[PDB]
Paper text:
The computationally designed i301 nanocage is a promising NP synthetic model with increased particle uniformity and thermostability.
This flexibility is expected because, not only does the symmetry mismatch generate multiple possible conjugation patterns, but CAP255 gp140, the SpyTag–SpyCatcher complex, and mi3 are all connected via flexible linkers. Reconstructing the particle in 3D using a large mask diameter (equal to the box size) and imposing icosahedral symmetry yielded a map with an average resolution of 9.4 Å, composed of an NP surrounded by twelve weaker CAP255 gp140 Env trimer densities. To better resolve the NP core, the CAP255 gp140 Env trimer SpyTag and SpyCatcher densities were masked during structural refinement, and icosahedral symmetry was applied, yielding a 5.4 Å resolution map. The fold displays the expected α/β barrel structure and monomers superimposed onto the 2-keto-3-deoxy-phosphogluconate (KDPG) aldolase from Thermotoga maritima, computationally-designed NPs and mi3. The resulting symmetry mismatch between trimeric Env SpyTag and pentameric SpyCatcher means that only twelve copies of Env, instead of the twenty predicted, are present on every NP.
Author numbering:
A (entry chain s), B (entry chain H), C (entry chain C), D (entry chain Q): 115 to 318
The structure:
C-alpha cells in the first residue's frame, strides 16, 4: 500500500524545523501546494507531538510519516503518535524488526551495494538513497543491472533542476528537504506547487 | 473582546465556496497568508460542518465566525458548531436577541442612517456596511459627523486598490470576499499575504 | 405565471403621461413597437380609466398592469379596472396582503438589503429595484451572493446604453420610463423597437 | 411658515464645532455673510446653550434651529432653548410626535423611498436627504416621478461646484456643513457670501 502511495505521489517532503509551530506551518504549506507524503524528521523538537497534531490532515488525504528515526524508542513514539511510515538515514535491523512486528512500512537509508543487499535480506525492496547529492542518479542507474527489482527514493540535494534526472535514472519517488521546506509558509507552498508541476511534466 | 480582535487584525475573509472541501481549503489558505478572522458564509453547503471542522485552527489563533446568517435557526447551528462571531447582510432583531442571550458577538449589516440607529438601539456600535461597493467610503465619512462612536466593517467590492481608502475613511476593519477568496488555494494564500501587507502599509 | 411573462418579455414600459389620451397613445405606441408588458402609473390622471380602456389590447397579447401604487385604495381601483399586476416604488405590507387575497401579482420596490428581506418574508422573490440609477447594476451583483434566489426588475435611468449591463448583472427584466415613453407616439414606437432589438442582442 | 423660510433663504448652515465659543463665532460669521437659517447640531458641546445664547440674532432676522437631534430628550432641550426648527439625520417617530405636540417644525432625514413614505405617513412633505453625497441629485430627480409633492433639503457634500446642480434637480433648499462652516470666522463669512451669490445666480 505504501509503495503505491510513493509511486502515485512521487514526492516526499522531508521536514526539518526548529519548533513544533514551524514544522506544522511548513507541513500545511507543502500539503496546500499538493505534496501529500510528509516526513516529520526526529530533528524537529517534539516530532511525535507534530505527527499527532497533524493527524487531522489524514482525513484530507495527507500521509504523515516519521524521518531521521535512529532508535526503536523513536520508532515507537512515531507509531504511537500515528506515523504511517518510518524513514531512517541508515539501515537499522532493530527498527526493521520493530516495524515488521507493528505492520508499519519502514524505508531504510542505504549508500552502498552491501547495505542494499543487507536491506533486501531484511525484506526491504524500497530503499532511501542517502545522501543523494554524493551518490547521484548514476548510482541508481548502476544498481538497475545487478538489482533490477530494487526501487530508490533519493534524499539530499534534490531540487527543481535535477528532479527530472532522478526520475530518468528510474527512482520510485524523491525525498525533498531544504529546496522545498526552506522559507516562509507562502514560499514553501509555492515551491511545493512548482515541484509537483515539474515532476508531472517529466513523469507522465 | 471581538472589537479588539477586529481592530488588531483589520481584515475578515468573507468565505463563499461551492463545497465543504473548497471552503476548508480556502480557509486554510487565507490563514496561511496571515488572515486570522475567517467568516464562513451560510451560502457554503454545510457551513456548520465547515465551522466545526475548522475548530482546530482556533488553537493556532484563527477566529472562526459565521456570515450570511439570515435566521435564528442558522445562528443556532453556527454557535453550536463553534462560531465565535455572527455576521448578517441585514439588521435582524431576532438574531440580535439570540446572540445577546448566547453571549456571542453579532455584527448586523446596515446600508442607511435609519438602519444604523435601529442597530444602535439594539446595542450594536460595530456595524457591517453592506454593500460597500454601492455606498462607498463616502458613507463612512458622512456617518462620522452624526454618529462619531459607530465603527464600520465594509463588505462588498473591497480590493487591493481601494482598501487603504476605506481605512482613510475611518473603518475599523474590512470584509474581503472575491478579491481574496477567488482562485486556487495557492493564489488565495498569496492574495491574503498581499492584503495583510497593503493594510499594514496604510494603517501603521 | 407573471414571473414567466417578465422572463419572456424582459421589458416593462413604465408609462407616465399628463392625460388619459396621451397615456393610451403611448401604450399603443410601445405595444406596436413590440413591448407587451405595460405599467400604467397612478401619476397618470384617471389611471384606472386608462387601464380599463386598454383592456382590448389583452386580446392582442398585451399585459396591462398598474404602477406607482401607494395605497390599497389605488390597488383596488387598479384590480377592478383589470390590472394584471401591481407595482409600487416602495414595499407596502397592506398592498402585499391585498394583492395576495385578490390573487394578483405584486412587485414591491426595494432599495436596501433590509427592505429586500422584509419583502421576502411577505413572500416576494421578484422585486422592483428603485431608483435603479442610484443603486446601479453593482447592487444586483452584490445581492447575488447573500440572496441567490431573489430576482430584480430595475426601474429608473434604464436606457439603450446601459440595458445590456443590467442583464449582465443578472436582472429578470427592466422597467423603462422616460427613455422609452418620452416623445411623440411615432418616436415612442421606434424607441420600443430599438429597446426590444437591443435586449434581444444581449440576452440570447 | 418654515417651508416659506426654507424656500426664501434656500440655504441652511449645518453648524458643527468643538466648543460653545467656536459655534457662536461661526453662527455669527454665516449670518454676517447672509445665511439666515442656522442649524446648531447636537454634536456641538452644550448645543442648547449655543441656541439660547444666539437667541438675540432672531431680532436681526436669523432663524435658529437644532440639528443631529436623535432623542426626544435632545428635542426637548432644543425647543426649551428656543430652537425654531428640529432636524435629524434619520426618521424618528418619537421626535415627530413630540414636534407635532409642541407645534415645532420637524425635518426628518431620509435616504430611501420606504423611509420617505413612512415620513409622509407621519405628515412630513419636506425631508432632509442624507447623506446627499451618497444619493446625489439623481435621487431627487427620481423621486419627482412617484412623489411629486415631496420636497428635499439635501445635507452632506453640498459645495460651491455642485449647489446649482442640486437646485436644477428640484430641491427646496440645501444644508451646507464643512464647505461653509470650516475655517476661521472671516473665511466662514466670505464662504457664506459666496454661497448666497452662487445660489442666487442659479435660482433667480
Amino acid at each position: 500500500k505504501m509503495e503505491e502511495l510513493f509511486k502515485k505521489h512521487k514526492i516526499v517532503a522531508v521536514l526539518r524545523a526548529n519548533s513544533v509551530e514551524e514544522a506544522k506551518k511548513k507541513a500545511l504549506a507543502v500539503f496546500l501546494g499538493g505534496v501529500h507524503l510528509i516526513e516529520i524528521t526526529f530533528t524537529v523538537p517534539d516530532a511525535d507531538t507534530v505527527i499527532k497534531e497533524l493527524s487531522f490532515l489524514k482525513e484530507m488525504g495527507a500521509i504523515i510519516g516519521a524521518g531521521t528515526v535512529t532508535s526503536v524508542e523513536q520508532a515507537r513514539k512515531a507509531v504511537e503518535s500515528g506515523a504511517e511510515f518510518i524513514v531512517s538515514p541508515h539501515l537499522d535491523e532493530e527498527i526493521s524488526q520493530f516495524a515488521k512486528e507493528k505492520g508499519v512500512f519502514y524505508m531504510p537509508g542505504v549508500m552502498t551495494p552491501t547495505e542494499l543487499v543487507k536491506a533486501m535480506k531484511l525484506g526491504h525492496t524500497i530503499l532511501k538513497l542517502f545522501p543523494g547529492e554524493v551518490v547521484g542518479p548514476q548510482f541508481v542507474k548502476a544498481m538497475k543491472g545487478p538489482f533490477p527489482n530494487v526501487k530508490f527514493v533519493p534524499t539530499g540535494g534534490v531540487n527543481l533542476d535535477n528532479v527530472c534526472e532522478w526520475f530518468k535514472a528510474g527512482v520510485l519517488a524523491v525525498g525533498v528537504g531544504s529546496a522545498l521546506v526552506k522559507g516562509t509558509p507562502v514560499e514553501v507552498a509555492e515551491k511545493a506547487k512548482a515541484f509537483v508541476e515539474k515532476i508531472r511534466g517529466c513523469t507522465e
